[PDB]
Amino acid sequence: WAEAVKEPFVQVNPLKNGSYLVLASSTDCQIPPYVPSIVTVNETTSCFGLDFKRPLVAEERLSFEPRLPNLQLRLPHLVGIIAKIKGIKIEVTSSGESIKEQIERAKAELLRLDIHEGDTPAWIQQLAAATKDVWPAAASALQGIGNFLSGTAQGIFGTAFSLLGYLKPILIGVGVILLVILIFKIVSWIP
Amino acid sequence: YTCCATSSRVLAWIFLVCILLIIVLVSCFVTISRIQWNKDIQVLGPVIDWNVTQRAVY
């Protein structure tokens, strides 16, 4: 299962034996982001705006803690866009799924998020964020052509293109009327 | 008069070429942006394995 969340994300659970369980979108006290971890400190300090205390020395007894098997997991490239356009917690793969089945799963859905006359700049900015890891040269270009339609002047070019997009059916109609005149006017020159 | 008649002709040509280029620039952008999106969808995605040691920053 995948689900979209708000940035910044911070979760710190104090454990009973005196360690702390941390999952956080940003670094603090040398703890890496995005991967969770069990954290212990030798001297009281403030991390993620709260106090992580040094635990009381304990006596060792025979353990019964479980040790689960490790597991690599491959996710779809655009998992973030799939989770965002559902607005609920959604199933994205299985532990033991093939590359082919995994891909043919949100492909039709994703293809039909096509370019529109009404949010071309907002679309072009998604395409860049999607392309950045694949082709960084193209991303930087797309991002540029994004900010040109949005920012340059008062966004007048964005406006102009948006409007010329919505007019397409009228233009064809006129274009057709011109041909029907031109053909007649031409045929009415030949002897 | 001849200069004004010539100016009108030259203006119309540059005005025609101006549009026929804009038609070609917009057409090429729509083709390339839509293909890249298709390729973005089918790329291999990230891998996660819950290894902390791997993500250490010094």
Binding site: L21, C29, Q30, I31, P32, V35, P36, S37, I38, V39, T40, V41, N42, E43, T45, R67, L68, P69, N70, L71 | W50, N51, V52, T53
Partner: peptide, 17 residues
């Protein structure tokens, strides 16, 4: 400004369980 350090140990959680 004097160098003072605190030790911080970290371990993994297979499968996130």
């Amino acid at each position: 400004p004097v160098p003072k350090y605190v030790e911080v140990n970290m371990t993994s959680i297979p499968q996130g369980v």
